[PDB]
RNA sequence: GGGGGCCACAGCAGAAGCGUUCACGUCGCAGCCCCUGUCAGCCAUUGCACUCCGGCUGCGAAUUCUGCU
RNA sequence: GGGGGCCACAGCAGAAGCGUUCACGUCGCAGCCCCUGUCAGCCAUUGCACUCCGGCUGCGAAUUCUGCU
């Protein structure tokens, strides 16, 4: 079940919303063009984010590459999204 | 060993330096005139501060009154200062 | 923010679009590199000062056309 | 910040001192009370969204003289 958008959890939920999107973009993008990183610190979401890539191969590349990597003293649990983000759905 | 300046430790060391001086002043001052609250988040000092009162009776009042009070979900360990602050020393 | 340095970089002026900002006006806005006030993340610390000072890690902003020599 | 209300409050104008701000200029600055964006503190949460949204607690800025009716 691979698709354009990777899904990361086990993130340091104490990190500000903007510094997260920034540092997340910094860790990736060296895999392909990133379309958008989606975050929200609500109770439902919290320590997790959606990194949307331009081509699926960059998602597969970064998923296998960056798994378990320590991000703010915490290991990343990367996996493909249940559904491709509605921006990719409009493709 | 009572004197003008009370000494508090066991403070929430994760609190910003300014919000501490503010909320500390807010909890006291209803005991007498506060001259100055001295704080610094250095490793040497950290979770502790010096509340300087105008008359010693306010220090005794607040010390016996506010002992163990929960300040930012943490109990206050109040006690008199080893030496009266050099501002009181210049009296 | 702040300081320094690049084969990295025509120069100056206007205009628009941005950044900062509560918000306009002044102002400022290519690209990497290094140091660094902040701020933040773990980690450590229960500690008696009035002078700033723990380790490690990370963020550290804003560009386009137009004309002249 | 934002909104509302007080036996709490002469009115307006200038001047100085402050606040905001990287920094001046514009601007804004009695006192309590209530609600509340932020921000922060514990607490809880390992959670598949693209619409904002967990509980509790706390911070939530800046005044003086001068003249006129």
Tab-separated table of C-alpha atoms (C1' of nucleotides) in Angstrom:
chain	number	residue	atom	x	y	z
A	1	UNK	CA	0.000	0.000	0.000
A	2	UNK	CA	2.330	2.785	-1.181
A	3	UNK	CA	1.210	6.235	-2.269
A	4	UNK	CA	2.377	9.834	-2.601
A	5	UNK	CA	2.019	10.846	1.063
A	6	UNK	CA	4.061	9.374	3.917
A	7	UNK	CA	2.710	9.407	7.479
A	8	UNK	CA	4.981	10.037	10.472
A	9	UNK	CA	4.056	9.604	14.121
A	10	UNK	CA	6.078	9.266	17.357
A	11	UNK	CA	7.107	12.904	16.956
A	12	UNK	CA	8.082	15.199	19.820
A	13	UNK	CA	4.612	16.626	20.466
A	14	UNK	CA	6.135	19.491	22.505
A	15	UNK	CA	7.566	21.092	19.331
A	16	UNK	CA	5.910	24.230	17.966
A	17	UNK	CA	3.801	23.779	14.848
A	18	UNK	CA	5.997	25.982	12.658
A	19	UNK	CA	9.405	24.664	13.734
A	20	UNK	CA	8.053	21.185	12.979
A	21	UNK	CA	7.021	21.930	9.390
A	22	UNK	CA	10.378	23.668	8.916
A	23	UNK	CA	12.670	20.987	10.342
A	24	UNK	CA	10.594	18.226	8.731
A	25	UNK	CA	10.998	19.896	5.345
A	26	UNK	CA	14.711	20.197	6.128
A	27	UNK	CA	15.166	16.478	6.826
A	28	UNK	CA	13.397	15.431	3.619
A	29	UNK	CA	13.176	17.270	0.254
A	30	UNK	CA	16.612	15.717	-0.394
A	31	UNK	CA	14.501	12.866	-1.734
A	32	UNK	CA	12.349	14.795	-4.133
A	33	UNK	CA	10.116	17.801	-4.252
A	34	UNK	CA	7.888	18.154	-1.200
A	35	UNK	CA	4.438	19.537	-1.935
A	36	UNK	CA	3.211	20.228	1.597
A	37	UNK	CA	3.793	19.185	5.203
A	38	UNK	CA	0.521	19.111	7.150
A	39	UNK	CA	0.569	19.400	10.948
A	40	UNK	CA	-1.796	20.253	13.785
A	41	UNK	CA	-1.241	19.974	17.546
A	42	UNK	CA	-4.828	18.963	18.348
A	43	UNK	CA	-5.511	16.078	20.717
A	44	UNK	CA	-6.686	13.979	17.765
A	45	UNK	CA	-3.485	14.526	15.772
A	46	UNK	CA	-0.697	15.800	18.052
A	47	UNK	CA	2.714	14.126	17.592
A	48	UNK	CA	2.253	13.224	13.918
A	49	UNK	CA	2.415	14.865	10.495
A	50	UNK	CA	1.771	14.278	6.781
A	51	UNK	CA	4.626	14.899	4.338
A	52	UNK	CA	3.256	15.017	0.787
A	53	UNK	CA	5.707	14.280	-2.025
A	54	UNK	CA	5.554	15.091	-5.741
A	55	UNK	CA	6.311	11.583	-7.038
A	56	UNK	CA	5.626	8.350	-5.171
A	57	UNK	CA	9.236	7.170	-5.516
A	58	UNK	CA	10.390	10.010	-3.252
A	59	UNK	CA	7.881	8.820	-0.647
A	60	UNK	CA	9.207	5.260	-0.907
A	61	UNK	CA	12.792	6.555	-0.881
A	62	UNK	CA	12.368	8.681	2.242
A	63	UNK	CA	10.205	6.076	3.997
A	64	UNK	CA	12.836	3.341	3.726
A	65	UNK	CA	15.696	5.797	4.273
A	66	UNK	CA	14.544	7.837	7.277
A	67	UNK	CA	12.791	5.118	9.294
A	68	UNK	CA	13.634	5.274	12.991
A	69	UNK	CA	15.783	8.376	12.497
A	70	UNK	CA	16.030	10.465	15.712
A	71	UNK	CA	14.041	13.688	15.311
A	72	UNK	CA	14.315	15.964	18.355
A	73	UNK	CA	15.521	13.037	20.482
A	74	UNK	CA	12.705	10.748	19.335
A	75	UNK	CA	12.467	7.962	16.716
A	76	UNK	CA	10.308	8.494	13.653
A	77	UNK	CA	7.627	5.910	12.837
A	78	UNK	CA	7.217	6.428	9.088
A	79	UNK	CA	4.599	4.642	6.972
A	80	UNK	CA	2.437	5.274	3.932
A	81	UNK	CA	-0.845	7.123	4.365
A	82	UNK	CA	-4.148	5.262	4.574
A	83	UNK	CA	-5.365	7.454	1.701
A	84	UNK	CA	-3.469	9.832	-0.559
A	85	UNK	CA	-4.050	13.415	0.534
A	86	UNK	CA	-6.963	15.167	-1.149
A	87	UNK	CA	-4.516	17.463	-2.959
A	88	UNK	CA	-2.976	14.398	-4.617
A	89	UNK	CA	-6.536	13.132	-5.061
A	90	UNK	CA	-7.204	16.184	-7.238
A	91	UNK	CA	-3.846	15.587	-9.048
B	1	UNK	CA	17.763	33.434	61.803
B	2	UNK	CA	15.090	35.731	60.333
B	3	UNK	CA	15.778	38.694	58.076
B	4	UNK	CA	14.221	40.881	55.390
B	5	UNK	CA	14.672	38.498	52.441
B	6	UNK	CA	12.957	35.117	52.119
B	7	UNK	CA	14.491	32.367	49.973
B	8	UNK	CA	12.335	30.038	47.867
B	9	UNK	CA	13.500	26.909	46.077
B	10	UNK	CA	11.706	23.859	44.607
B	11	UNK	CA	10.277	26.140	41.921
B	12	UNK	CA	9.225	24.997	38.456
B	13	UNK	CA	12.556	25.644	36.728
B	14	UNK	CA	10.854	25.440	33.301
B	15	UNK	CA	9.089	28.790	33.893
B	16	UNK	CA	10.327	31.859	32.020
B	17	UNK	CA	12.297	34.373	34.061
B	18	UNK	CA	9.763	37.180	33.638
B	19	UNK	CA	6.578	35.194	34.286
B	20	UNK	CA	8.245	33.982	37.487
B	21	UNK	CA	8.994	37.447	38.881
B	22	UNK	CA	5.452	38.464	37.918
B	23	UNK	CA	3.537	35.538	39.417
B	24	UNK	CA	5.800	35.509	42.483
B	25	UNK	CA	5.037	39.179	43.083
B	26	UNK	CA	1.362	38.318	42.593
B	27	UNK	CA	1.341	35.593	45.256
B	28	UNK	CA	3.031	37.806	47.854
B	29	UNK	CA	2.872	41.622	48.270
B	30	UNK	CA	-0.412	40.908	50.100
B	31	UNK	CA	1.911	40.612	53.082
B	32	UNK	CA	3.713	43.891	52.764
B	33	UNK	CA	5.605	45.928	50.253
B	34	UNK	CA	7.948	43.869	48.090
B	35	UNK	CA	11.187	45.617	47.192
B	36	UNK	CA	12.527	43.252	44.533
B	37	UNK	CA	12.258	39.653	43.348
B	38	UNK	CA	15.622	38.365	42.112
B	39	UNK	CA	15.753	35.420	39.699
B	40	UNK	CA	18.167	33.835	37.244
B	41	UNK	CA	17.853	30.545	35.345
B	42	UNK	CA	21.565	29.696	35.514
B	43	UNK	CA	22.678	26.196	36.475
B	44	UNK	CA	23.904	27.543	39.819
B	45	UNK	CA	20.558	29.144	40.692
B	46	UNK	CA	17.781	27.708	38.496
B	47	UNK	CA	14.545	26.776	40.316
B	48	UNK	CA	14.896	29.316	43.135
B	49	UNK	CA	14.373	33.026	43.767
B	50	UNK	CA	14.870	35.796	46.342
B	51	UNK	CA	11.836	37.844	47.394
B	52	UNK	CA	12.988	40.957	49.258
B	53	UNK	CA	10.477	42.578	51.609
B	54	UNK	CA	10.339	46.090	53.071
B	55	UNK	CA	9.886	45.083	56.723
B	56	UNK	CA	11.011	41.798	58.256
B	57	UNK	CA	7.532	41.030	59.617
B	58	UNK	CA	6.211	40.667	56.061
B	59	UNK	CA	8.971	38.129	55.400
B	60	UNK	CA	8.016	36.185	58.532
B	61	UNK	CA	4.321	36.518	57.656
B	62	UNK	CA	4.689	35.215	54.104
B	63	UNK	CA	7.209	32.534	55.107
B	64	UNK	CA	4.870	30.928	57.642
B	65	UNK	CA	1.801	31.570	55.478
B	66	UNK	CA	2.896	30.393	52.024
B	67	UNK	CA	5.035	27.390	52.992
B	68	UNK	CA	4.385	24.368	50.790
B	69	UNK	CA	1.896	26.302	48.657
B	70	UNK	CA	1.607	24.833	45.119
B	71	UNK	CA	3.220	27.197	42.606
B	72	UNK	CA	2.875	25.970	39.015
B	73	UNK	CA	2.104	22.446	40.253
B	74	UNK	CA	5.078	22.383	42.626
B	75	UNK	CA	5.464	22.970	46.392
B	76	UNK	CA	7.383	26.003	47.596
B	77	UNK	CA	10.273	25.488	50.028
B	78	UNK	CA	10.419	28.888	51.733
B	79	UNK	CA	13.090	29.882	54.262
B	80	UNK	CA	15.003	32.952	55.371
B	81	UNK	CA	18.091	33.993	53.431
B	82	UNK	CA	21.578	33.116	54.650
B	83	UNK	CA	22.396	36.834	54.440
B	84	UNK	CA	20.139	39.828	53.898
B	85	UNK	CA	20.397	41.027	50.311
B	86	UNK	CA	23.012	43.702	49.684
B	87	UNK	CA	20.241	46.224	48.981
B	88	UNK	CA	18.944	45.680	52.522
B	89	UNK	CA	22.588	45.701	53.616
B	90	UNK	CA	22.808	49.280	52.334
B	91	UNK	CA	19.438	50.066	54.045
C	1	G	C1'	18.823	38.919	15.155
C	2	G	C1'	24.488	39.847	15.492
C	3	G	C1'	29.620	39.110	13.367
C	4	G	C1'	32.947	37.304	9.617
C	5	G	C1'	34.095	34.731	4.597
C	6	C	C1'	33.312	32.565	-0.476
C	7	C	C1'	33.919	31.657	-8.337
C	8	A	C1'	29.144	33.129	-4.919
C	9	C	C1'	28.224	37.607	-6.799
C	10	A	C1'	27.681	43.778	-13.008
C	11	G	C1'	26.767	48.936	-10.540
C	12	C	C1'	23.231	52.440	-9.462
C	13	A	C1'	18.177	54.290	-9.692
C	14	G	C1'	12.954	53.630	-9.984
C	15	A	C1'	8.455	50.272	-9.975
C	16	A	C1'	5.788	46.334	-8.264
C	17	G	C1'	5.509	41.995	-5.057
C	18	C	C1'	7.271	40.466	0.126
C	19	G	C1'	9.474	40.724	5.250
C	20	U	C1'	9.422	43.041	9.900
C	21	U	C1'	5.110	45.176	12.428
C	22	C	C1'	-1.121	45.042	16.312
C	23	A	C1'	-1.313	48.079	11.621
C	24	C	C1'	0.286	51.401	7.975
C	25	G	C1'	5.013	55.084	6.902
C	26	U	C1'	10.373	55.081	7.392
C	27	C	C1'	13.327	50.809	6.682
C	28	G	C1'	15.072	46.131	4.976
C	29	C	C1'	14.672	41.353	1.106
C	30	A	C1'	19.799	36.858	-4.333
C	31	G	C1'	22.915	32.181	-3.148
C	32	C	C1'	25.559	29.020	-0.155
C	33	C	C1'	29.829	28.695	4.491
C	34	C	C1'	31.514	29.746	9.636
C	35	C	C1'	30.849	31.834	14.566
C	36	U	C1'	27.044	33.586	17.586
C	37	G	C1'	22.171	36.879	21.405
C	38	U	C1'	17.912	34.871	21.495
C	39	C	C1'	13.987	30.964	21.251
C	40	A	C1'	13.167	25.619	21.392
C	41	G	C1'	14.292	20.215	22.137
C	42	C	C1'	16.016	16.234	25.123
C	43	C	C1'	19.907	15.631	29.208
C	44	A	C1'	21.634	17.080	33.783
C	45	U	C1'	20.783	19.874	38.154
C	46	U	C1'	16.823	20.652	44.891
C	47	G	C1'	20.751	24.385	43.975
C	48	C	C1'	21.786	30.990	49.251
C	49	A	C1'	22.590	34.672	45.106
C	50	C	C1'	22.306	40.462	44.050
C	51	U	C1'	27.872	40.531	37.473
C	52	C	C1'	26.950	37.312	32.225
C	53	C	C1'	27.829	31.756	31.852
C	54	G	C1'	25.989	23.532	32.327
C	55	G	C1'	26.374	19.643	28.277
C	56	C	C1'	24.377	18.035	23.509
C	57	U	C1'	20.983	18.962	19.520
C	58	G	C1'	17.907	22.150	16.244
C	59	C	C1'	15.226	26.498	14.168
C	60	G	C1'	17.638	31.232	13.051
C	61	A	C1'	12.960	35.539	7.776
C	62	A	C1'	11.903	38.753	2.914
C	63	U	C1'	12.644	38.819	-4.804
C	64	U	C1'	10.886	40.090	-9.299
C	65	C	C1'	10.482	42.799	-13.617
C	66	U	C1'	11.915	47.989	-15.584
C	67	G	C1'	15.796	51.921	-17.002
C	68	C	C1'	20.706	54.349	-17.005
C	69	U	C1'	26.364	54.428	-17.103
D	1	G	C1'	-4.200	41.116	22.340
D	2	G	C1'	-9.904	40.768	21.701
D	3	G	C1'	-15.039	41.546	23.805
D	4	G	C1'	-18.358	43.236	27.615
D	5	G	C1'	-19.503	45.758	32.661
D	6	C	C1'	-18.776	48.759	37.299
D	7	C	C1'	-19.716	54.605	42.584
D	8	A	C1'	-14.942	53.150	39.157
D	9	C	C1'	-14.605	57.320	36.525
D	10	A	C1'	-15.059	65.949	35.015
D	11	G	C1'	-14.559	66.951	29.334
D	12	C	C1'	-11.360	68.428	25.657
D	13	A	C1'	-6.550	70.198	23.999
D	14	G	C1'	-1.310	70.614	24.419
D	15	A	C1'	3.512	69.179	26.910
D	16	A	C1'	6.670	65.831	28.999
D	17	G	C1'	7.581	60.781	30.689
D	18	C	C1'	6.279	55.493	29.062
D	19	G	C1'	4.346	51.219	26.034
D	20	U	C1'	4.410	48.738	21.469
D	21	U	C1'	8.605	48.337	18.037
D	22	C	C1'	15.019	45.745	15.574
D	23	A	C1'	14.632	51.320	15.773
D	24	C	C1'	12.492	56.012	15.239
D	25	G	C1'	7.351	58.477	13.105
D	26	U	C1'	2.057	57.509	13.122
D	27	C	C1'	-0.465	55.357	17.182
D	28	G	C1'	-1.798	53.917	22.080
D	29	C	C1'	-1.110	54.414	28.183
D	30	A	C1'	-6.024	55.771	35.259
D	31	G	C1'	-8.560	51.823	38.572
D	32	C	C1'	-10.686	47.307	39.585
D	33	C	C1'	-14.636	42.876	37.420
D	34	C	C1'	-16.136	39.088	33.702
D	35	C	C1'	-15.425	36.313	29.130
D	36	U	C1'	-11.666	35.239	25.756
D	37	G	C1'	-6.965	34.499	20.605
D	38	U	C1'	-2.519	33.738	21.960
D	39	C	C1'	1.777	32.137	25.077
D	40	A	C1'	3.163	29.080	29.319
D	41	G	C1'	2.657	25.290	33.370
D	42	C	C1'	1.530	20.412	35.004
D	43	C	C1'	-2.045	16.322	33.368
D	44	A	C1'	-3.660	13.222	29.654
D	45	U	C1'	-2.870	11.324	24.816
D	46	U	C1'	1.351	6.676	20.097
D	47	G	C1'	-2.993	9.126	17.788
D	48	C	C1'	-4.428	8.448	9.421
D	49	A	C1'	-5.843	13.836	8.834
D	50	C	C1'	-6.230	18.010	4.693
D	51	U	C1'	-12.126	22.836	8.717
D	52	C	C1'	-11.159	25.398	14.307
D	53	C	C1'	-11.466	22.462	19.110
D	54	G	C1'	-8.746	17.607	25.457
D	55	G	C1'	-8.940	18.674	30.979
D	56	C	C1'	-7.050	21.869	34.919
D	57	U	C1'	-3.998	26.013	36.263
D	58	G	C1'	-1.461	30.821	35.368
D	59	C	C1'	0.628	35.264	32.858
D	60	G	C1'	-2.328	38.604	29.763
D	61	A	C1'	1.572	45.849	29.013
D	62	A	C1'	2.014	51.755	29.118
D	63	U	C1'	0.847	58.021	33.532
D	64	U	C1'	2.210	62.601	34.977
D	65	C	C1'	2.088	67.707	35.218
D	66	U	C1'	0.009	72.103	32.184
D	67	G	C1'	-4.338	75.081	29.998
D	68	C	C1'	-9.469	75.940	28.286
D	69	U	C1'	-15.101	75.468	28.589
